[PDB]
Amino acid sequence: MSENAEPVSKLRIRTPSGEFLERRFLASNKLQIVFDFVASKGFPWDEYKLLSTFPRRDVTQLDPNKSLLEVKLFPQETLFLEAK
């Protein structure tokens, strides 16, 4: 849940193949960590685009030096991989 502990974001990311990556992050940390994570799964940010509904935006387009809190990825959010 939530307290005066560290904020943490749970992310569900759906690969094109339809599988889901699921992974929890420090919400105060850089978005890059997410980019690193998908990349490490085979979906480098140059090959694929990382999409969010909510409003539908392409997360890979954001500044990886921003926190998840800043880019509005907290506390749970599903993202969608999509080749370019």
Side-chain angles (χ1 to χ4, degrees), residues 2-84:
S2 298
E3 98 107 339
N4 324 348
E6 271 273 355
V8 169
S9 304
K10 198 172 195 168
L11 297 200
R12 291 184 75 245
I13 314 159
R14 168 230 233 271
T15 79
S17 36
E19 321 278 24
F20 274 89
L21 311 191
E22 191 170 324
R23 168 69 187 247
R24 300 166 215 253
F25 296 93
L26 286 157
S28 29
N29 270 211
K30 290 183 206 273
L31 177 61
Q32 185 68 56
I33 294 183
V34 180
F35 296 159
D36 279 10
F37 173 74
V38 300
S40 83
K41 265 39 187 59
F43 307 94
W45 63 77
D46 59 317
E47 292 184 29
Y48 304 86
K49 57 186 166 165
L50 195 64
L51 296 154
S52 64
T53 35
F54 236 12
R56 50 182 193 269
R57 64 205 145 94
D58 184 9
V59 162
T60 51
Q61 238 70 11
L62 316 190
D63 172 13
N65 279 15
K66 287 195 175 196
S67 61
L68 313 192
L69 246 28
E70 287 172 284
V71 306
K72 262 62 182 306
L73 293 180
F74 170 82
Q76 283 209 30
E77 246 284 335
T78 308
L79 299 167
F80 300 78
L81 285 156
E82 186 167 306
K84 313 188 154 192

